[PDB]
Design a protein around this ligand. Structure first.
Ligand SMILES: O=c1ccc2ccc(F)c3c2n1C[C@H]3CN1CCC(NCc2cc3c(nn2)OCCO3)CC1
Ligand SMILES: [Cl-]
Ligand SMILES: [Mn+2]
Ligand SMILES: [Mn+2]
Ligand SMILES: [Mn+2]
Lengths: 481, 192, 483, 189
DNA sequence: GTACCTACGGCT
DNA sequence: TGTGCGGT
DNA sequence: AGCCGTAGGTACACCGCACA
């Protein structure tokens, strides 16, 4: 009962550091998620909060996640869910929110007692096949529930939505990307394991921010994709236009990713006020729901508007850099990874998911066909089946007699005893036969997939292609030069 | 005011200030409004009942002070209509019984400290749709379309038609004598 | 429209708020003793199956479920209401069984809802008992997506047992808690004599009984409160004078008045000493512990008269506090000042209705089941023909029609037959069905006997109340001293 | 914020430093108030290894601990003025409780080192099954963690002042890389 | 992670 | 030095 | 006075890392 201070510091600090690293601040390379986000989405899945259903109150979603999966504060959970519903934060939003979910001015969401949420349609693709033994479940924090170690993630979410996180001894900053480009990149990789980063860059041009804007040049992108680290220069979308009486204005319609618009405006106001920038006569945020983002900087008559714009870029967040630092959990450990690595781990995850799903579907189809073979024997000899049951004093005796007389398994005998008399009508008998015939065909299709690795790989391609066609959208961020 | 999200125009004749219950409603209102002519002032919950409070308490209350500063008219004897920063002061409480209560508290304050603002027809009551626990439950476009868009909104202009009757109504409903308020409830309550 | 008269706006908006606070927030229903938030909390616990035999469930989750389904208000109002129902210093018969930090007599609040866990107490099962036997009317919830109870069956007199306090609009309420044994004995005496007087009822119900024990001074305040619904009741702490060594003494307080914050009472005594408004006190300590119970010690100066000091403490601090009884509850959905008898009468009438409605529900249910059994007896006695009828039929609609006409069966009987699983054809099932049928006919007769005789129904209410009294009734804690 | 004990004899008095008011309430009810004081601390405490002295002395939680201990700090540290002979760190049993423990030890080691040398600093061992002390009932907290008859307190011992100095600098200091290297060298994934 | 206002009646 | 975001 | 208990609101700290 004596503790050396040095040993205590080392073990307690390591305990904390390791936990923040593998179970808090860093995303998994396979699904792009940290624990709180995974638990929020799993919670939505388990409470049936699909896009075709009505919005559910946020307080309730949060209460459920806290109880069953996430032993931490309600505010960490709610704020994480809120960001997933912000179209200025997530390139492909994962939560469909109803109500005040915050704004680009740093206004927070309304209290969870007011807002409502459900899954977006793309989130269905993160969860698809989760109940087909595609991913390993683990015990939750108190051993009363089960939770997914990782989501099937049928689209490359790490790269699609990006991630940022501050851990201990390290951090991560992965920018979002265009979904059509990423899937084309995965498809190219799938046809050539030895593809180079430069080759992958014919599909994946660079980041694609939800807030659009511009990226200056490709050297920082290239460095980031090659090594996991690189500086990417982002600029607002700004133009110079006339405003009457020989005067001009600078009009900003897109801002850099993660830049608070109100803050950026106050920074300009502060520079004007302190006379650290010349030529500006007015500053207005004309953003509206109907006009979109619109920040106007009026320029003094005869002043060079282009000079003023270059000055705003040097002195304000109108120009901002994104420091790429691609750290993710790979096999449960933090790893700095390049673009190809990120895609390789994602692709392997997809192959495993689709293989496991195919194996699961085969087991369940064989089980069900076995049951239907039992029901078909019962229909073929219904008079005898009835006599056998009627002569039997108990269920146990009837079970044994059915197994003995009709060479049935215990599962088949129990299915026959469970069959309702309505199943004996013409339509119901035909349904039993039709389901069986369809099932034999389905079993044949599954066996083909499992017998040939190229057929499986091709199925992965086809499913990715379908997702690309349904959810892929245009590039927003312009890469200049 | 720190909480005031003012409009661009400085021409009072065309500007409107919307009074909402807090930041939950303020965020939706801020995003949906027309920032050129519509200012928003989120207010911190149940408003001080000025009919029950003495002057020192009233003048030191943060929400009261915000409203006075934002309207720019001064108060009581020093009220100057000509200095009104908005020609429409719009009460936009949440669509619940508590929002109705907040509305009575706000009207009490305007009636006792800014009566000419009411007499001039500058005080309005917004009509957000029912079925929402608060404006923070509404999307910004729904709030704009149903409640703030002048092309579709239905604002109620508050009218003072008999001052003696209004004085008695404010004293009875909002004053310190419980018995008269109990009597009013008993005489008017329809439990159906 | 376009215009709105200020006077009309004020009258209508204020009345809207006042009525809502009165009938759906701050005042308890006379029948179950509950306000909407508490009723929704208990119904929530029942619907999520959070009974005393199941593990504790996270408070945050309970509150989230209540918030979404039944109570469209702040999470803090819900959690704090739940917390109070779990405090043994607040509720004479706690309705919630809490795990974790649920606050103290010193005004410490509960731990954040993220940390605590809760479930129903055993006595709460009595509030909810028979709720699914059409004993009480259900209503639509706030958004039309759920159903909630307008009132609970409340198989014990909860209004009076746990009491209530509420600040509404135009009025308030203050009902003290009572001893459950005494209350049930009072309801029983009343059930045998509609003309019983308040004085006779007081032979059963001696006065309030606080979860915090203590003393009540005299019966005058109690008597008027029971006769009129209003009266002042003087509560006094339990205090004794004892030696502490070397010829010195101390006052030791082991019980304090209901709703008095212990730490604040101690600060008030300390304030009086510091400002020299009381003479003779040399030390003040809170020696309260989980092992020893409440123990507040006030050291007295050698040779000072400890009883004079104690009397001064009663006059100058909350060591003595009054409970202003003001018994307002919702009666037929309207607030009413009620006396002790009127409270018991409405409670007893609620019990008669609950038991009557339950009996009627059980009767409809038993007859429905007897009807089904009749159809199954026919099916089993003619099974070969039943099966061939079904096999020859292309759809179950055709099967249903043939079964009904051929065997003189209702639609419900024919459906039950089509739903019957093959395992129901075993040899001993036909007798098992016959046994249930015979028992059911007897049961129907027993239920019909109850509904045909008001005295038999009334006796069933007495027996059920008596069983609750024997299982949950406990000793009086508050001593009433005369006086 | 301090809920002191009755006794004013430091030799027999103990102060428990707990995580949040949530834990404070259970602790205050379950303790022996004659000899046990409770100081509830608000969240993660300041990392004194990274902070400027002016910020350290101005921090509310740091001030409350100095006032409670009564010994003063640094060069003015007077071990004889200690108001308790047992300063017990009782954080919730998990990774953030572990983190708060390292932060507290950092403060004690850099500002009240003799307190550790004198053997006045202890670590409580609340049961592992509760991710917060506010989840436990007062009696269970008393029995398992605060009752001298059954509790298992760890006495903090300083064995090598040079190795300790390097450890606090490495783990708690501003140089990220040494912390990243320590993690890489010692992590058992 | 917590502390505080308000309505309401009664006594790079 | 302020800010991105999961934690107390 | 300020306390009781359901209601309407919401504001400020701490850790950890890496950018400009
Ligand atoms: O605005 C302010 C301003 C200042 C301030 C100061 C101190 C202070 F403590 C607080 C302050 N506040 C707010 C307040 C802090 N809040 C955090 C969130 C907390 N919510 C609990 C909760 C609800 C749930 C749930 N789980 N947990 O699960 C599902 C149902 O709803 C309630 C207290
Ligand atoms: Cl004496
Ligand atoms: Mn055959
Ligand atoms: Mn509101
Ligand atoms: Mn913890």
């Amino acid at each position: 009962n004596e503790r050396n201070i040095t040993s205590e510091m080392r073990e307690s600090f390591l305990d904390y550091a390791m936990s923040v690293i593998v179970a808090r601040a860093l995303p998994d390379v396979r699904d792009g998620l940290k624990p709180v986000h995974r638990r929020i989405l799993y919670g939505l899945n388990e409470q049936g909060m699909t896009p075709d259903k009505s919005y559910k109150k946020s307080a309730r979603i949060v209460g459920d996640v806290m109880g069953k999966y996430h032993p931490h504060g309600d505010s960490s959970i709610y704020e994480a869910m809120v960001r997933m519903a912000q179209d200025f934060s997530y390139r492909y939003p994962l939560v469909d929110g109803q109500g005040n979910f915050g704004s680009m001015d740093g206004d927070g969401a309304a209290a969870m007692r007011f807002t409502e949420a459900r899954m977006t349609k793309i989130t269905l693709e993160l969860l698809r096949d989760i109940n087909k033994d595609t991913i390993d479940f683990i015990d939750n924090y108190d051993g009363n529930e089960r939770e997914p170690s990782v989501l099937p993630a049928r689209f490359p979410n790490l790269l699609a939505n990006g991630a940022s996180g501050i851990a201990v001894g390290m951090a991560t900053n992965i920018p979002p990307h265009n979904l059509t480009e990423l899937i084309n990149g995965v498809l190219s990789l799938s046809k050539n394991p030895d593809i180079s980063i430069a080759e992958l860059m014919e599909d994946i041009e660079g980041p694609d921010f939800p807030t659009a804007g511009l990226i200056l040049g490709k050297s920082g992108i290239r460095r980031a994709y090659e090594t996991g680290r690189g500086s990417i220069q982002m600029r607002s979308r700004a133009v110079i236009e006339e405003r009457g009486g020989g005067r001009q204005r600078i009009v900003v319609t897109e801002i850099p990713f993660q830049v608070n618009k109100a803050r950026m405006i106050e920074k300009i106001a502060e520079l004007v006020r302190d006379k650290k920038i010349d030529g500006i006569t007015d500053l207005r945020d004309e953003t509206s729901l109907r006009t979109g983002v619109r920040v106007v900087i009026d320029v003094r008559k005869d002043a060079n508007a282009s000079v003023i714009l270059n000055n705003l870029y040097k002195q304000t967040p109108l120009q901002t850099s994104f420091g790429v630092n691609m750290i993710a959990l790979v096999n449960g450990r933090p790893k700095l990874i390049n673009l190809k690595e990120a895609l390789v781990h994602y692709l392997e995850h997809q192959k495993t998911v689709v293989r496991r799903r195919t194996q699961y579907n085969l087991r369940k189809a064989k089980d069900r066909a076995h049951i239907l073979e039992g029901l078909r024997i019962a229909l073929d000899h219904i008079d005898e089946i009835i006599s056998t049951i009627r002569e039997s004093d108990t269920d146990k005796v009837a079970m044994e007699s059915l197994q003995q007389r009709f060479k049935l398994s215990e599962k088949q005998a129990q299915a026959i005893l469970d069959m309702r008399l309505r199943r004996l009508t013409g339509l119901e008998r035909d349904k039993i036969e039709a389901e069986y015939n369809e099932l034999l065909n389905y079993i044949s299709e599954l066996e083909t997939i499992l017998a040939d690795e190229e057929v499986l790989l091709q199925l992965v391609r086809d499913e990715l292609t379908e997702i690309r066609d349904r959810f892929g959208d245009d590039r927003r961020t312009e890469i200049q030069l | 005011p720190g909480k005031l999200a003012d409009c661009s125009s400085k021409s009072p004749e065309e500007c409107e200030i919307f009074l909402v219950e807090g930041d939950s409603a303020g965020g939706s209102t801020k995003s949906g409004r027309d920032s050129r002519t519509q200012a928003i002032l989120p207010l911190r919950g149940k408003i001080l009942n000025v009919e029950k409070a003495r002057l020192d308490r009233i003048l030191n209350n943060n929400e009261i002070r915000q409203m006075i500063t934002a309207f720019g008219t001064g108060i009581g004897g020093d009220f100057d209509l000509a200095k009104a920063r908005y020609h429409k002061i719009v009460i936009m409480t949440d669509a619940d019984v508590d929002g109705a209560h907040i509305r009575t508290l706000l009207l009490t304050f305007f009636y006792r400290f800014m009566r000419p603002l009411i007499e001039a027809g500058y005080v309005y009551i917004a009509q957000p749709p029912t079925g929402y626990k608060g404006l923070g439950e509404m999307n910004a476009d729904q709030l704009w379309e149903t409640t703030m868009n002048p092309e579709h909104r239905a604002l109620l202009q508050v009218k003072l038609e008999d001052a003696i009757e209004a004085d008695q109504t404010f004293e009875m409903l909002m004053g310190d004598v419980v018995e008269n308020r109990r009597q009013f409830i008993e005489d008017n309550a329809v439990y159906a």
